[PDB]
Write an enzyme that holds these catalytic residues in place. Structure first.
Site: not given
Ligand SMILES: [Ca+2]
Length: 279
Positions: A39, A69, A161, A175, A200, A224, A260
């Site tokens: 990052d 960040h 995003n 994948p 996933d 993020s 959910d």
């Protein structure tokens, strides 16, 4: 262990229901694991890291996080108050400049760096990498993420995003790595969260309180923010001996809260990261 008045995302990860505020976790807390945060860097001096964070690599003129960040993401992985795995070791790899940007070639170098660098670190319980970054589809970026994973690192990456199918983004579309979407405190898919077959898992990503630079704290939103919840969870589970780098994504999916979340598009997993901790 119980942490009262925890950030909602921590409470969510140890709960079968939304709307609670205590985070429950095994005291082992990721001790003996390592998480690389690839990052803008990590402000290792932040009291919240308790000396467990260190910068190990930069591609720029400084290793300092001049953005925040990376520090925020690292905080969600492993800070004392804001972190999932409160005793993990955190390693910062600064592939993003202080504007939060990075050329794909630098990002790739950072991934290959981690694959080697783990051999210079003490991580008896296992190694995780958190990649709260991405851009357009790139076979080379995906391949780098795949190598990192193949080398024995649990790779968690942001879905993106764009409120779009993550198939068109990298490393999200790889994948073999764990691609993480974002949810909010009411179990809605975060409005910005990417989706699609390549996802996933989902983790808390809207209004996430964590560490920030200048020894401060901050609430921000993004895939993020969801990614380090999953990375921290993986480290925590690896310390417990529940899983390994090669199957932590599968294990997290299989033990997730299922069905959910709301506004999950048809064909996207409805799975929310869950530690299955019984106090
Ligand atoms: Ca996968």
């Amino acid at each position: 262990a119980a942490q009262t008045n925890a950030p909602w995302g921590l409470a969510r990860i140890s709960s079968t229901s939304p709307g609670t505020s205590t985070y429950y976790y095994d005291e082992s807390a990721g001790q003996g694991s390592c998480v690389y945060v690839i990052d803008t860097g990590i402000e290792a001096s932040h009291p919240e890291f308790e000396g467990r964070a260190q910068m190990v690599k930069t591609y720029y003129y400084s290793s300092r996080d001049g953005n925040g960040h990376g520090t925020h993401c690292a905080g969600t992985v492993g800070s004392r108050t804001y972190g999932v795995a409160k005793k993990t070791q955190l390693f910062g790899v600064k592939v993003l400049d202080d504007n939060g940007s990075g050329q794909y070639s630098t990002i790739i170098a950072g991934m290959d760096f981690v694959a080697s660098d783990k051999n210079n670190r003490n991580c008896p319980k296992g190694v995780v990498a958190s990649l709260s970054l991405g851009g357009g589809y790139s076979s080379s970026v995906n391949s780098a993420a795949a190598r990192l994973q193949s080398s024995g690192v649990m790779v968690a990456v942001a879905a993106g995003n764009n409120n779009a199918d993550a198939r068109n983004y990298s490393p999200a579309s790889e994948p073999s790595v764990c691609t993480v979407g974002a949810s909010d405190r009411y179990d809605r898919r975060s409005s910005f969260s990417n989706y699609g077959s390549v996802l996933d898992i989902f983790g808390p990503g809207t209004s996430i309180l964590s560490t920030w630079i200048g020894g401060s704290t901050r609430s921000i939103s993004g895939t993020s923010m969801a990614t380090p919840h999953v990375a921290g969870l993986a480290a925590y589970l690896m310390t417990l001996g529940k899983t390994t780098a090669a199957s932590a994504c599968r294990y997290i999916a299989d033990t997730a809260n299922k069905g959910d979340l709301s506004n999950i598009p048809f064909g996207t997993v409805n799975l929310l990261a869950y530690n299955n901790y019984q106090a």
